[PDB]
């Protein structure tokens, strides 16, 4: 311990940075990310312009 | 204690209308400790760490 910790703590922050940096996939992309999988890309909307 | 405003219609009215704008930068020795993080439902639910 203190090695699993100091790794789970660091690894947890990486998970947190994916849900917010990649929205509209929260609690689902991180699960696939851990197992080494991906999501279907074409279903998601995306923004074109912002003025 | 009572200076009348002769040129103004109302002597007791507050003639002026002031708008203030102050910006201050103040180096301080306060700690300004860390910013916590939210909790992910996937962890502690699907047991990713087991």
- Residue corresponding to tokens 């851990």: A34
The CA radius of gyration of chain A, in Å to the nearest whole number, is: 15
Mapped onto helix, strand or coil, the DSSP state of residue A19 is helix
Q: Is B40's CB within 8 Å of A19's CB?
A: yes
Closest CA to B43 of A30, A51, A50: A30
Task: Work out the number of other CB atoms within 10 angstroms of the CB of residue B43.
Answer: 19
How far is residue A31's CA from residue B42's CA, in Å, rounded to a whole number? 7
DSSP state letter for B24: -
Q: Distance from CA of residue B31 to its chain's centroid?
A: 20
* Long-range contacts of the stretch A41-44 (C-beta < 8 A, 24+): none
Question: B42 to chain A nearest CA, in Å?
Answer: 6
């Amino acid at each position: 311990d203190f090695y699993n910790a100091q790794k789970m703590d660091e690894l947890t922050r990486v998970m947190r940075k994916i849900c917010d940096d990649n929205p509209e996939y929260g609690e689902e992309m991180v699960l696939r990310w851990a197992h080494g999988l991906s999501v279907d890309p074409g279903r998601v909307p995306f923004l074109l312009a912002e003025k | 204690a009572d200076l009348p405003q002769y040129p103004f219609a109302d002597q007791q009215a507050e003639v002026c209308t002031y708008v203030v704008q102050s910006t201050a930068v103040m180096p301080t020795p306060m700690i300004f400790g860390p910013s916590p993080v939210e909790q992910l439902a996937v962890i502690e639910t699907e047991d990713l760490f087991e």
